[PDB]
Amino acid sequence: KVFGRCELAAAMKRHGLDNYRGYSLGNWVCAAKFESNFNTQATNRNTDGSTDYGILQINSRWWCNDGRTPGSRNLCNIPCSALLSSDITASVNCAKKIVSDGNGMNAWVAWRNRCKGTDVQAWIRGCRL
Ligand SMILES: [Cl-]
Ligand SMILES: [Cl-]
Ligand SMILES: [Cl-]
Ligand SMILES: [Cl-]
Ligand SMILES: [Cl-]
Ligand SMILES: [Cl-]
Ligand SMILES: [Cl-]
Ligand SMILES: [Cl-]
Ligand code: NA
Ligand code: NA
Ligand code: NA
Ligand code: NA
């Protein structure tokens, strides 16, 4: 599923990501934009053999099981495939664990490089939320 901008903002708010660990909704929308262009089916192979999945490009080294990442963990206790669903529940629940891990949203390198410090509210501007 490719979400619209306000459509994803609303879904993220419904699942309790708005101001989760102090990160406003615009932060999450921005991160999704640059991770996946709002596409739940986005996948990206890493040089290390891990793969990133879904709207927030969650990695198989730590967070989900894909059966092909040697030595990895599955801290969110999910098959990585659940991260590709039109239902963002599994993506959101897993992102809450990731953002709680110590480094906040810096866990998403694209958030640090493209969203951090910017006018992230622009991402929810205009939306009925
Ligand atoms: Cl957009
Ligand atoms: Cl915001
Ligand atoms: Cl497996
Ligand atoms: Cl594995
Ligand atoms: Cl594990
Ligand atoms: Cl599994
Ligand atoms: Cl959803
Ligand atoms: Cl933080
Ligand atoms: Na994701
Ligand atoms: Na894994
Ligand atoms: Na999901
Ligand atoms: Na950018």
Domains and CATH numbers, the chain: 1-129 (1.10.530.10)
Q: How large is the angle between the packed helices 5-14 and 25-36, nearest 10 degrees? A: 130
Question: Which residues, listed in sequence order, are joined to residue 79 by a DSSP beta bridge?
Answer: 65
CB 84 within 8 A of CB 2: no
Q: What resolution in angstroms, rounded to 1 decimal?
A: 1.6
Closest CA to 43 of 30, 31, 56: 56
Instruction: Return phi, psi of residue 80, to 5°.
Output: -55, -30
CB 46 within 8 A of CB 53: no
Residues near 66 by beta carbon (within 8 Å), at least 6 away in sequence: 51, 53, 60, 79, 80, 81
Give the single-character DSSP code of 103.
S
Q: What is the CA radius of gyration of the chain?
A: 14
Which strand (E) or helix (H) includes residue 7?
helix 5-14
CB 96 within 8 A of CB 12: no
3-state percent breakdown (helix, strand, coil) of the chain, nearest 5: 40, 10, 50
Return d(Cα 114, Cα 14) in angstroms, integer.
Answer: 25
What technique determined this structure?
Answer: X-ray
The three-point CA angle 111-54-6 to 5° equals 70
Give the single-character DSSP code of 79.
B
Question: Which residues, listed in sequence order, are joined to residue 128 by a DSSP beta bridge?
Answer: none
CA of 64 to the centre of ligand 6 (A): 7
CA of 51 to the centre of ligand 10 (A): 9
Return d(Cα 60, Cα 66) in angstroms, integer.
Answer: 7
CA of 11 to the centre of ligand 7 (A): 5
CB 14 within 8 A of CB 6: no
Which residues belong to the active site?
35, 52
Q: What is the dihedral of CA 99, 53, 36, 27, to 10 degrees?
A: -10
Ligand with smallest separation from the Cα of 5: 1
